């Protein structure tokens, strides 16, 4: 329980884009209250081999950060859409059609004109004006927030205890939220 | 005021008294409410690209 704990699995909130709070993986537990030492020892080696994978998965995939579940992810640490620039082939020459029309020709329908060899091409930035920060998506909640294997739980001075497992806890208030 | 239940002209039907009917304004609703089915799953409108 302290040596081989149950991992705290994180609850996502798709609206705020943050983790709600982590509770232990109670719903994937395996029942060896009817097993003996030939099989309790084999299941406890699977509880511990899983916890080695989750520490290995967090060392590969989770972003190194001080506060677990921060409230505003920076724009450099959030996956952002960076598309290719949009290449716009402009259909009509503007000042070559105000000279045909002033000369008396009625243009209708629609190089693309037979009376103009000129062709304008415009290249526009597709991405946003400012990079987005504040909340991670679903796919970055999968990469980060690997379930926390919390060895020897709640034994270190308080304040070092993980309060960001709790779904009521504001980090910048250091208090649990209420109904008002 | 009908003085007499009987049908046919009589002296008592000179005392019957007239009252105008009530004014009833029948029109389309404000901003044309009720012409267009909104918020019905069985009559939901479509804007789609062909």
């Amino acid at each position: 329980s302290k040596e081989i704990p149950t991992p705290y699995m994180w609850s996502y909130q798709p609206q705020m884009g943050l983790a709600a709070g982590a509770a232990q993986d109670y719903s994937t537990r395996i029942n060896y209250m009817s097993a003996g030492p030939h099989m309790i020892s084999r299941v406890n080696g699977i509880r511990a081999h899983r916890n080695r994978i989750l520490l290995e998965q967090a060392a590969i995939t989770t972003t190194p950060r001080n506060n677990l579940n921060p409230r505003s992810w920076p724009a450099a640490l959030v996956y952002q859409e960076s598309p290719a620039p949009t290449t716009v082939v402009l259909p009509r020459d503007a000042q070559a059609e105000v000279q045909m029309t002033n000369s008396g020709a009625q243009l209708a329908g629609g190089g693309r004109p037979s009376f103009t060899p000129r062709q304008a091409i415009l290249t526009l930035q597709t991405s946003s004006s400012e990079p987005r920060s504040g909340g991670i998506g679903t796919l970055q909640f999968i990469e980060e927030f690997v379930p926390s294997v919390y060895f020897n739980p709640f034994s270190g001075p308080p304040g070092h205890y993980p309060d960001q497992f709790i779904p009521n806890f504001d980090a910048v208030k250091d208090s649990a939220d209420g109904y008002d | 005021y009908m003085p007499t239940i009987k049908e046919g002209n009589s002296r008592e039907l000179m005392g019957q008294q007239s009252m105008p009917n009530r004014p009833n304004y029948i029109a389309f609703r404000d901003n044309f409410i009720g012409l267009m089915y909104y918020n019905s799953t069985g009559n939901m409108g479509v804007l789609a690209g062909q």
Partner: protein, 50 residues
């Protein structure tokens, strides 16, 4: 009588209108615009206009 909970003699399947499965209180399942009705599993319709 027969106990449909135990013997599999189910007979109230026809009394279902729609099913709506939403994970994590806002993400609908299967999501991703999979069905012609986007946010739920409509099983039957009494009024079929479309």
């Amino acid at each position: 009588g027969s106990i449909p909970y135990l013997d599999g003699t189910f007979y109230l399947n026809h009394t279902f209108k729609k099913v709506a499965i939403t994970f994590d209180s806002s993400v609908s399942w299967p999501g991703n615009d999979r069905l012609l009705t986007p946010n739920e599993f409509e099983i039957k319709r009494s009024v079929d206009g479309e």
